[PDB]
Ligand binder design. Structure first.
Ligand SMILES: Nc1ncnc2c1ncn2[C@@H]1O[C@H](COP(=O)(O)OP(=O)(O)OP(=O)(O)O)[C@@H](O)[C@H]1O
Ligand SMILES: [Mg+2]
Lengths: 470, 476, 117, 119
């Protein structure tokens, strides 16, 4: 049908279309306009309905600047929520929120598959019992804080301490050993990361599969809100239609609440909490709940998430933090030591396998590791105050082994091959546990500490020590 | 007429024109097939709150009225299923086939309809059963921060309530569906599903279902209470229900108060919690026990919702964050946890022995701080500290393996008398299970006597059997 | 007021309040500077303040259900006499815990006897 | 403070727009109208005087609240009373440091000035 514009209110837009047969909530309306005379300005705009009003008026939100909108101009309604283009054809390019590629390498054909963004979460019927652990191929992650597939992961790491290297390695491993593809959706600052990912993941070829979606701070509130949901619809296509054993990734959750900070400005309604929208928990939940495992296909939408807010008691970080499953921390002081990845023994949950299923050895090893690290920390405190030489023999042996344990944590990443020159190593979780057990058992107390660096397996440590000409 | 046209739609609220005869609180079902609750009448336009998905609603739709107040179907058929807050199946397995329906706005049992609590509720956790007993009909508040093991405690209780007649209704509000499915599978594995009902509303659902969920759960429990069946209701979290009602209230343009919640929070929580009571002998002896949950940020009790709920509860269970992180499972603080109705439901033997343990635990807790200050200590303080360490060791439960009360009283008596001094701290854990097995295979008569009499048996032969186990046990 | 309650009662009440306020500031001083930097008279002030705040606890009647103690009803004259006795430091030897949850000062003495003092 | 509460209640019932703490816009106008009549008439008029000692209540000694600020900016001095000195054994509990009076040198007898300066 066709309806005319009657009101404009800037960012909230509040275009009150007068129409014959109204479109449902979340439906898409597209405006086409031409410069009939010198005064008028041609504009092509898309809007999303958000609220019905008295008589025929339907409130909307515009995804771009409304400068040049004139009362009386005709509007056409598409018939369905804003349709992202998705499928094989769309793989391998960077999109805006609406669906056009920002880089002008190519244009998506009209014939392609287009799916609506807003979909109800998977029913309770299709869910699956979740006990299994996803393998990351990173020794520390597989030893201290494993990730439950289908669950949200948190990584509290400052920019420049290895965030980009860590996520590149994760997506490379998940595309090398698994059938999983990744999806990235940023909202903040500058995307210099585009060229780093271009280098490594285009050498790997995964760039052709990862369908990045970008809309950043310069965009109006509506696009900054709906970008994450476009990113999620990218994964939803794979899980529903493809149904491959693709345990895919999506790399942003909290950024939706960072955009929700601006969604509070998008509302234009009664304030609540600390200026936040009333529907904060519901609005975040609608996104978070679409990430699930399922029996329709072997697709776990497990996501690694960075939280820029980093304030505990604030309502939005608390509401987001309630949904998180596992947590990890990246700190600069550990980066100083040359131990990479710079992850510390902080962990969360991940007990679905160990010790729940059997997991006895894994759980006991992890507990001993954390205990030894904290004992080494207090011993290091004592050493500075008075001196190590006065420590007893049995207490000194703890530091002796702790040095090796601390240094073994480093892993020679595959992505680092283009800078360091190391080919890179992938480790199975069982191999990590089995190999590390001997370290706690003191099989290799005599070996020099420097051998325990940037190696995948314990035999590699032994051979490196040998190569040092012992 | 009974048919009216909707003129507004937004975020779960709709107005309608017409509907002259509609009653306040009535259920109205739209032409889409979804139904809503008529909160407010007006001179010309009724205000309707929409329970289901509102996207399909349009201006010009015709809404009809069912003709009844808000009702939740109930019946024994529901036992062993998973249902929405509104009584519609969300798990396949065909329809519900319920017997009858009960409104959600029932009047609570008034004064002189109740009696003092006299029947205990065995959670199977040594710490909860021993130091902070809970009785049937006592509403016990469980406060703790996230990642502290609260749901472990609730599931352990529901699992342990196997022999005792206890229709246990479990409700999760706003929780993640994956956790709900994991909990349902966990209950099925232990065979606790045949006597339990799970009703849940997740975060994805509209707020009206989230705020309706716990009332529907307690209305489910009410039917079983009236016939005389004992009932247990567990709420996964009340704070998120408060947030959902905050959403609904402020979307209705009602001024907020302290913090951000409207003034109706106390009415909302108290009306829900008041329906759980121990009915008197004249009424039929039915009992409803509630175990609500609330989330405290950074473990601070001083806040609007936590204190508001504490004003209603008959007791509090405080789960310590850092104690949980240290490795003690589950986490509970001796100082802040108290039960008003405790001691009138706990069996005689537990009061005979366990009563000394709580004072020892608290005194050890404070002496622990002083000893942390003190490098050098006298022998009596050292003995007190060692006893405290042993008590802390004995109080650590195994997950999903509740222990019967008789074993609890035996092990706690064995500890209190002090035979464990020779046994090293680490050896105590293995000692407990070996002692359990030795009592089970050989020492039957003591267990049978405690099961029937409810009192400690002859001390001489009891100590003889304990000493025989001490003979068989080998120190590391 | 001195006329309503009697001179000795008023003086005891006000000396108790003064000592408790002095301790209320001494705790902050201790937190910032430590417990070792206090003066001898300050040590005495803290010493008596602890016992005074402890003795104010009373075993109750209705608490017999909650904890299982008998309970006591303390006359005013016993209160003022006991408070004067502790204020003058006649019970320097007794430990602090003996003043916890007791009705009459004779029960304090009995509790200290039970402690083995 | 109760006068301010009564005026706030009677204003809010009238639907007059609120202000800093729901107080109407006329609070300072009203208190200045009240307090400005206190004066010391000249010798010509007759030499009368109308001195005032208004009281203000404050929670937790937060004398920086709206009404205390208004009254302290209208008055010619304040006497700050604190429960801390009150239970400290010094009564009446007057804070000498925070108390100021802007008639300090003129409203005293000469011997009182002479001794009180050194005091
Ligand atoms: N007593 C315990 N012993 C061992 N592991 C435990 C214990 N309690 C909890 N856990 C582990 O920690 C996890 C904590 O899950 P839980 O649901 O209890 O967390 P919570 O944040 O305290 O509660 P909720 O999710 O209800 O708010 C459990 O899934 C389990 O793996
Ligand atoms: Mg839980």
């Amino acid at each position: 049908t066709r309806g005319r514009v009657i009101q404009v209110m800037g960012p909230v837009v509040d275009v009150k279309f007068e129409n014959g047969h109204l479109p449902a909530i979340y439906n898409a309306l597209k405006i086409q306009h031409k410069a009939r005379n010198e005064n008028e300005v041609d504009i092509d705009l898309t809007l999303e309905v958000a609220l019905h009003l008295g008589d025929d008026t339907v409130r909307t939100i515009a995804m771009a600047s409304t400068d040049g909108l004139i009362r009386g101009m005709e509007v056409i309604d598409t018939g369905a929520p804003i349709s992202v283009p998705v499928g094989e054809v769309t793989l391998g390019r960077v999109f805006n929120v609406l669906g056009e590629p920002i880089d002008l390498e190519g244009d998506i054909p009209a014939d392609a598959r287009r799916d609506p963004i807003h979909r109800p979460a998977p029913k309770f019927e299709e869910l699956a019992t979740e006990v299994e652990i996803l393998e990351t191929g990173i020794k520390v992650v597989d030893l201290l804080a494993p990730y439950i597939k289908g669950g949200k992961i948190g990584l509290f790491g400052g920019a420049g301490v290895g965030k980009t290297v860590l996520i590149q390695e994760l997506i490379h491993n998940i595309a090398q050993e698994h059938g999983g593809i990744s999806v990235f959706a940023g909202v903040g600052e500058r995307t210099r990361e585009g060229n780093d990912l271009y280098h490594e993941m285009k050498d790997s070829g995964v760039i052709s599969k990862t369908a990045m979606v970008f809309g950043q701070m310069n965009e109006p509130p509506g696009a900054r809100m709906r970008v994450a949901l476009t990113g999620l619809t990218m994964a939803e296509y794979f899980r529903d239609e493809q149904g491959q054993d693709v345990l895919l990734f999506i790399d942003n959750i909290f950024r939706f609440t960072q955009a929700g900070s601006e969604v509070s400005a998008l509302l234009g309604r009664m304030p609540s909490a600390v200026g936040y929208q009333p529907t904060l928990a519901t609005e975040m939940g609608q996104l978070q709940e679409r990430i699930t495992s399922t029996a329709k296909g072997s697709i776990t939408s497990i996501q690694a998430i960075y939280v820029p807010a980093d304030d505990y008691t604030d309502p939005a970080p608390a509401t987001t933090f309630s949904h998180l499953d596992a947590t990890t921390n990246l700190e600069r002081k550990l980066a100083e030591m040359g131990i990479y990845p710079a992850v510390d023994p902080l962990a969360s949950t991940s007990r679905a396998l160990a010790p729940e299923i059997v997991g006895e050895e894994h759980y006991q090893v992890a507990r001993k590791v954390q205990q030894t690290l904290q004992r080494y920390k207090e011993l290091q405190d004592i050493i500075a105050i008075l001196g190590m030489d006065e420590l007893s023999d049995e207490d000194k042996l703890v530091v002796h082994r702790a040095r090796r344990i601390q240094f073994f944590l480093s892993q020679n990443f595959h992505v680092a091959e283009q800078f360091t020159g190391q080919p890179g190593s992938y480790v199975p979780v069982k191999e990590t546990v089995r190999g590390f057990k001997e370290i706690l058992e003191g099989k290799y107390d005599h070996l020099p500490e420097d051998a325990f660096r940037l190696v995948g397996r314990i035999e590699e440590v032994v051979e490196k020590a040998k190569a040092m000409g012992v | 007429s009974d048919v009216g046209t909707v003129i507004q739609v937004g975020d779960g609220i709709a107005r309608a024109h017409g509907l002259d005869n509609v009653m306040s609180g009535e259920l109205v079902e739209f032409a889409n097939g979804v139904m809503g609750m008529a909160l407010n009448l007006e001179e010309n336009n009724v205000g309707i709150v929409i329970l289901g998905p509102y996207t399909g609603i349009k201006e010009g739709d015709e809404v009809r009225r069912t003709g009844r107040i808000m009702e939740v179907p109930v019946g024994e058929a529901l036992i062993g299923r998973v249902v929405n807050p509104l009584g519609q199946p969300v798990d396949g397995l065909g329809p519900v086939e319920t017997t009858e329906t009960r409104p959600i706005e029932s009047r609570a049992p008034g004064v002189m309809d109740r009696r003092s609590v006299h029947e205990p509720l065995q959670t199977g956790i040594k710490a909860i059963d021993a130091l902070v007993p809970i009785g049937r009909g006592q509403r016990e508040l469980i406060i703790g921060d996230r990642q502290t093991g609260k749901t472990s405690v609730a599931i352990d209780t529901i699992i342990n309530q196997k022999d005792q007649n206890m229709i246990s209704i479990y409700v999760a509000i706003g929780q993640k569906e994956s956790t709900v499915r994991t909990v349902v599978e966990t209950l099925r594995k232990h065979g606790a599903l045949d006597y339990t009902i799970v009703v849940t509303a997740s975060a994805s659902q509209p707020a009206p279902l989230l705020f309706l969920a716990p009332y529907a759960g307690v209305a489910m429990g009410e039917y079983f209470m009236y016939k005389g069946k004992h009932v247990l209701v567990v709420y996964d979290d009340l704070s998120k229900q408060a947030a959902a009602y905050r959403e609904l209230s402020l979307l209705l343009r009602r001024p907020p108060g302290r913090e951000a919640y409207p003034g109706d929070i106390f009415y909302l929580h108290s009306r829900l919690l008041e329906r759980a009571a121990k009915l008197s002998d004249a009424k039929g002896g039915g009992s409803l026990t509630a175990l609500p949950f609330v989330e405290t940020q950074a473990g601070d009790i001083s806040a609007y919702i936590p204190t508001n709920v504490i004003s209603i509860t008959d007791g509090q269970i405080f789960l310590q964050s850092d104690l949980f992180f240290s490795g003690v499972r589950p986490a509970i603080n001796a100082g802040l946890s108290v039960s008003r109705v405790g001691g009138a439901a706990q069996i005689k033997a537990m009061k005979k022995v366990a009563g000394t343990l709580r004072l020892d635990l608290a005194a050890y807790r404070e002496l622990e701080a002083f000893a942390q200050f003190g490098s050098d200590l006298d022998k009596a303080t050292q003995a007190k500290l060692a006893r405290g360490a042993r008590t802390v060791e004995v109080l650590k439960q195994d997950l999903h393996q509740p222990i019967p009360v008789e074993k609890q009283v035996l092990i706690i008596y064995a500890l209190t008398r002090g035979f464990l001094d020779d046994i090293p701290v680490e050896d105590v854990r293995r000692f407990e299970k070996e002692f359990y097995l030795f009592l089970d295979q050989n020492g039957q008569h003591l267990l049978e006597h405690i099961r029937t009499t409810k009192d400690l048996p002859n001390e001489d032969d009891l100590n003889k059997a304990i000493e025989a186990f001490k003979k068989t046990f080998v120190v590391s």
